[PDB]
Amino acid sequence: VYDLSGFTVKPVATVHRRIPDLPDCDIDKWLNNFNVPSPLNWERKIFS
Amino acid sequence: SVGGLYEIKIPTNFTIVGQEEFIQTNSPKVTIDCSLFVCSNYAACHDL
Numbered sequence: 001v002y003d004l005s006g007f008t009v010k011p012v013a014t015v016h017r018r019i020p021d022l023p024d025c026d027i028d029k030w031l032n033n034f035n036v037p038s039p040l041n042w043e044r045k046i047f048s
Numbered sequence: 049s050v051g052g053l054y055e056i057k058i059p060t061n062f063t064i065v066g067q068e069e070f071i072q073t074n075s076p077k078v079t080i081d082c083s084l085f086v087c088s089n090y091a092a093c094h095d096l
């Protein structure tokens with residue numbers, strides 16, 4: 001009597017959930033701003 | 049011994065006592081699929 005390698009039931013489909021209608025982060029508009037700071041005064045922006 | 053005789057307590061009445069004793073002769077036959085235990089179904093783990 002041989003106990004074979006354990007099988008797992010494979011996924012039939014995939015579920016993907018995300019919050020809809022969220023705005024674009026516009027990260028490029030902030031990184032491309034021409035008023036570039038020096039390392040001494042590095043600027044910060046938080047994207048949420 | 050007094051006069052070659054010794055004092056001894058000899059039973060004048062008796063009962064039967066029952067004492068149970070469990071002796072383990074077997075145990076749960078544990079089996080492990082080492083591959084399914086170590087790696088679940090992740091192919092990246094099974095390769096290693």
Ligand SMILES: *[C@@H]1O[C@H](CO)[C@@H](O)[C@H](O)[C@H]1NC(C)=O
Pocket residue numbers: 060061062
């Ligand atoms: C033995 O003990 C039982 C219970 O006390 C009693 O009924 C019986 O008469 C006794 N027998 C003798 C010979 O003492």
